[PDB]
Design a binder for this molecule. Structure first.
Ligand code: 4YH
Ligand SMILES: *[C@@H]1O[C@H](CO)[C@@H](O[C@@H]2O[C@H](CO)[C@@H](O)[C@H](O)[C@H]2NC(C)=O)[C@H](O)[C@H]1NC(C)=O
Length: 532
């Protein structure tokens, strides 16, 4: 009367599992807006210093947008690539000075650079018709650093949330966390759009970052626990695919409405619908059974059999763990580093997370010049992930879960290496090589997530995956400074480091035990002898 066999009897993947998976995938997309970052709220368009006198002249004679930028604005390329043109204003009186359209300012100085440069007051004039956060608070020239501060604060919030949000989810249940966390995320999201100043917006976004990953991973571990042992692959890969579909829909809607506040409100409000559909999914049977609440576990098992339509087994009355467990099974950070096998697995997984994040950031940084349309580039980037899900879904149960991950990490490393050594000049080959590298990186990410979830015990699974994921955020935060610093030492130093890191990660992946078709553990002592 173990949880595995009885679950198979009612059905590993039945209508109940299908409905629960669909309801959770509805939640998967809601994490795309929070994780994408500030790419759609903080895009910086072209900008010049507003001038009152230009408005009067704009109507007197025929004008064009390109023409106006040319001989009304200070020229670029002097004392910087575009520092003068971006946020410097000559301040020469353009009003009550009828110098003709042909020679508006040429006559006065007979030279452009030598002209007088005044302050860039009167705010700014931006190109895009829509409004972003940069346009809202004029975070353009003097406060340009504030965007980096916002991004870094959001990232450190992510890191803290990874470190801490796991314990509450693990100790107090997975449904309670998925409810409170998503509720806080929703109530902050709609609140950010009504944020008056720069501080409040940043605070609400920091809170949402603290809570979002906790919500997403609670849902992931809930669905993984619900699905049978054989079908973990399908559920996990489809959850990731649902996240990608949410990302694509985000790109589409972001193109639909540019205004950042309306975007945030439209993205946040639908989360209340999912909060309304919390009624469907009950607590994971495994967590309840481990916590010694067998009555509710059997009550739930009766329901799944009912919804499945297959008669429940008569043996449920004696449902329990394989061996008589202790009264208390509380999760704690202390228990995560006691068993040498568990400690080794945790270290390997943390290093794999860090390597994946660093390699991803390096690959995206070393990409080619950005396209004219940001939205199309983002859509293509999201689309490249679907082939990864197609590939991973067909090989996990036929070749295992260790060799694919090792080969994917090594493939991303070799992609970086070929980018470095072989000619990196603009060619059709380079874009395809970058796409292959991106596919390898996303395969690494998804495989690491799945194996890390499947490796830890049921009563500490969420905490372990959280702690191991925190290193991904740490690497994402730290890598830009590392790449900037190393570039000074030598021209191509960063890519050698990327290649060696990838090779070492691929090598270390081999130590991790295989998990092809093995029931996920429920006791730490059981997880210690998993390999044996
Ligand atoms: C610049 O825009 C982008 C921003 C981010 C990305 C992300 C690339 N990958 C989809 C990352 C996969 C990592 C991800 C998975 N799977 C993940 C899973 C578990 C994690 O730990 C619990 C985790 O850590 C943050 C990330 C998702 C949920 C974010 C692509 C982008 O291109 C579309
Ligand atoms: C950019 O602005 C300069 C203004 O100095 C333009 O140079 C003028 O070009 C016209 C012909 O298009 C000549 O008749 C003028 O004599 C030029 N000015 C001077 C001071 O020699 C230049 O053409 C502009 N370029 C664009 C693409 O708008």
């Amino acid at each position: 009367p173990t949880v595995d066999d009885v679950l198979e009897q009612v059905g590993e993947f039945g209508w109940f599992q299908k409905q629960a998976f669909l309801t959770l995938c509805l939640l998967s997309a809601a994490f795309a807006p929070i994780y994408v970052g500030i790419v759609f709220l903080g895009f910086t368009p072209d900008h010049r210093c507003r001038s009152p006198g230009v408005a009067e002249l704009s109507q007197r004679c025929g004008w064009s947008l390109a023409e106006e930028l040319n001989y009304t604005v200070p020229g670029l390329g002097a004392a910087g690539e575009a520092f003068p043109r971006q946020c410097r204003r000559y301040e020469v009186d353009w009003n009550q000075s009828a110098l003709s359209c042909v020679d508006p300012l040429a006559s006065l100085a007979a030279n452009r650079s030598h002209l007088p440069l005044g302050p860039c007051q009167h705010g700014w004039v931006y190109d895009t018709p829509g409004s972003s956060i940069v346009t809202e608070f004029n975070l353009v020239c003097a406060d340009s650093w504030k965007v980096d501060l916002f991004q870094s604060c959001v990232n450190v919030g992510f890191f803290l949330g990874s470190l801490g949000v796991g314990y509450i989810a693990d100790r107090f249940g997975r449904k309670l966390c998925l409810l409170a966390t998503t509720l806080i995320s929703a109530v902050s999201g709609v609140l950010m759009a009504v944020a008056p100043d720069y501080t409040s917006m940043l605070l609400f976004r920091l809170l949402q970052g603290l809570v979002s990953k906790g919500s997403w991973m609670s849902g992931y571990t809930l669905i993984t626990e619900f699905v049978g042992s054989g079908y973990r692959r399908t559920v996990a890969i489809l959850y990731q695919m649902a996240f990608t579909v949410g990302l694509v829909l985000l790109s589409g809607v972001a193109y639909a409405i540019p205004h950042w506040r309306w975007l945030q409100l439209a993205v946040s409000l639908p989360t209340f619908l999912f909060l309304l559909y919390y009624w469907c999914v009950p607590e994971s049977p495994r967590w309840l059974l481990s916590q010694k609440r067998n009555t509710q576990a059997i009550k739930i098992m009766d329901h799944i059999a009912q919804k499945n339509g297959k008669l429940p087994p008569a043996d449920l009355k004696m449902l329990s763990l394989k061996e008589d467990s202790t009264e208390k099974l509380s999760p704690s950070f202390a228990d995560l580093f006691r068993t040498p096998q568990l400690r080794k697995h945790t270290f390997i997984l943390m290093y794999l997370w860090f390597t994946s994040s660093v390699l991803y950031q390096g690959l995206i940084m070393h990409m080619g010049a950005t396209g004219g349309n940001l939205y199309l580039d983002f859509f293509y980037s999201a689309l490249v992930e679907f082939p990864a899900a197609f590939i991973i879904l067909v090989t996990i149960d036929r070749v295992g879960r260790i060799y694919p991950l090792a080969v994917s990490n090594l493939v991303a490393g070799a992609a970086c290496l070929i980018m470095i050594f072989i000619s990196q000049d603009l060619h059709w080959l380079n874009i395809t090589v970058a796409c292959v590298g991106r596919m390898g990186i996303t395969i690494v990410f998804q495989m690491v997530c799945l194996v890390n979830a499947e490796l830890y015990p049921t009563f500490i699974r969420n905490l372990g995956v959280m702690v191991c994921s925190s290193l991904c955020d740490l690497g994402g935060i730290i890598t830009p400074f590392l790449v900037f610093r190393l570039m000074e030492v030598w021209q191509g130093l960063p890519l050698i480091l990327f290649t060696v890191v990838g090779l070492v990660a691929g090598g270390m992946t081999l130590l991790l035990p295989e998990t092809k078709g093995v029931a996920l553990p429920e006791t730490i002592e059981d997880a210690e002898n998993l390999g044996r």
